Amino acid sequence: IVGGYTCGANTVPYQVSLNSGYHFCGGSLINSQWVVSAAHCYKSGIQVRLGEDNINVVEGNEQFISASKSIVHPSYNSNTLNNDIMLIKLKSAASLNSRVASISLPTSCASAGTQCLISGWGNTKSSGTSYPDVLKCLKAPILSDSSCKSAYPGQITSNMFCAGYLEGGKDSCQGDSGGPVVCSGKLQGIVSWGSGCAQKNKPGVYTKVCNYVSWIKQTIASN
C-alpha cells in the first residue's frame, strides 16, 4: 500500500496473509473454512495466517492453518487477469473471535464514487522498495467504468473495476495482491493489477467480486 496509513492491530480482522515460507499475497476470510484471494496468487504449499498485524513477529493473536485445497476460477485467464479470483479451503476451521472474523459477500455491486478500504502488507513505495511489517490501509474511491477504460484502453473487462486517485500517490501495490477491497461492509474487490503503483493516470484494478457470488456459494456448498 503506497500512501496509506497503519491500520491498527487486528482492526481488519478478515485480512489474511498467504505464506509459502514468506508473505506473498493477501486474502479475505469469508467464513471459518474459506478464504477468497486472487488466482494470480496461486501457489502450492500455502499456509493461511489469520489474526496478523506484524507478519514478522508472533504477537499472540495469530492462527496459522494450512490450506487443504485451492480452486482457481474456471475461466481465469492469467494473460489478461480476467476472472482473477481463487478460493482457498483451510484444513481446519478458524476460531472466529474479535481479531479473526469473516467479511460478508455482496448482494449488489458497489457504486462508482463509493469509498472503500484496501489493505495489505505490500510495497509502500511508488519508486523503489520498502515492505512494511505491520498491516497498511488505504481509503480509495471506485472510479467510473469510463475513466477506468480510458486509463487502460483495451484491457478492462466487466469483471474488473478501478479504484484510487488519478493524480498518483495512493494505491495498492506488489504484495497486496489477493487482499480485500471492502465497500459498505462487504467484499467488493480483490487487489489484482495496475501499471506500477501510485503512478499518475494508472489507478489500481480490482476483481469485481459481485460477479462471482454464485460461483463462490456453489463451490463452498460442494467442497
For 54, the grid coordinates are 506484524
Spatial CA neighbour of 114 closest among 140, 138, 150 = 140
Q: What does the alpha-carbon distance between residue 18 and residue 1 come to, in Å, rounded to a whole number?
A: 16
Beta strands (DSSP E) in 91-153 are 115-120, 136-141
User: Between residue 131 and residue 190, which ones bind Ca ion under the rule CB under 5 A?
Assistant: none
End-to-end CA gap in the chain: 33
Contact indicator for 68, 90 with CB cutoff of 8 Å? yes
Q: Which residues are catalytic?
A: 40, 84, 177
Q: Is 44 annotated as a binding residue?
A: no
For residue 61, the minimal CB distance to Ca ion (Å) is 8
Spatial CA neighbour of 1 closest among 117, 167, 143, 161 = 117
For residue 190, the minimal CB distance to Ca ion (Å) is 23
Q: Is 177 annotated as a binding residue?
A: yes
Nearer to Ca ion, 60 or 153 (CB): 60
Q: Is 83 annotated as a binding residue?
A: no
- What are the Cα distances from residue 47, in Å, to 17, 37, 68, 112, 187? 8, 13, 9, 35, 22
Spatial CA neighbour of 96 closest among 72, 126, 141, 65 = 65
Nearer to Ca ion, 25 or 72 (CB): 25
Q: Is 10 annotated as a binding residue?
A: no
Q: Is 28 annotated as a binding residue?
A: no
User: Between residue 33 and residue 62, which ones bind Ca ion under the rule CB under 5 A?
Assistant: 52, 54, 59
Q: Total binding residues for Ca ion by CB under 5 A?
A: 3
> Mask 63-92, x = binds Ca ion (CB under 5 A)?
------------------------------
Spatial CA neighbour of 220 closest among 31, 94, 46, 40 = 31
Contact indicator for 61, 15 with CB cutoff of 8 Å? no
Q: Is 182 annotated as a binding residue?
A: no
For residue 133, the minimal CB distance to Ca ion (Å) is 9
For residue 76, the minimal CB distance to Ca ion (Å) is 30
Spatial CA neighbour of 38 closest among 94, 89, 86 = 86
Nearer to Ca ion, 19 or 124 (CB): 19
For residue 135, the minimal CB distance to Ca ion (Å) is 10
Annotated binding site for Ca(2+): 52, 54, 57, 62
Annotated binding site for substrate: 171-172, 174-175, 177
The residue ranges that bind Ca ion (CB under 5 A) are: 52, 54, 59
Annotated binding residues, as ranges?
Answer: 52, 54, 57, 62, 171-172, 174-175, 177
